């Protein structure tokens, strides 16, 4: 029955798939009822690459500021080798990264 205290660490470029996954997350895990926290929500990094517009000195001095704003996002979750694996497999998706930095 070996217990493990996992920690769930997410990141994307859309606030709309992403929020989706700690609604699914923390209600595809309170179905499971797990001992967990609520979607912690980490300082928004947010890169601004100044660049001039022109192809050639010429031409006024005419500049840009395009950037990726991630929303970093993490979680928690206990549960054995069986019911963290059935959870990590499920949320499954476009835009997004899931780590399972495990705490054995």
């Amino acid at each position: 029955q070996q217990i493990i205290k996992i920690r769930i660490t997410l990141t994307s470029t859309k606030v709309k798939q992403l929020e989706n996954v700690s609604s699914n997350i923390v209600k595809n895990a309170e179905q499971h009822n797990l001992v967990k926290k609520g979607p912690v929500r980490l300082p928004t990094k947010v890169l601004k690459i100044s660049t001039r517009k022109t192809p050639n000195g010429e031409g006024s001095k005419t500049w840009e500021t395009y950037e990726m704003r991630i929303h970093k996002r993490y979680i928690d979750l206990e549960a054995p080798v069986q019911i963290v694996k059935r959870i990590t497999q499920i949320t499954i998706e476009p835009g997004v990264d899931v780590e399972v930095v495990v705490a054995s």
Binding site: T13, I49, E64, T65, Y66, E67, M68, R69
Partner: peptide, 10 residues
């Protein structure tokens, strides 16, 4: 580029 990631927000 505009694709690549680097829309904008200004």
């Amino acid at each position: 580029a505009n694709d690549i990631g680097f829309n904008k927000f200004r």
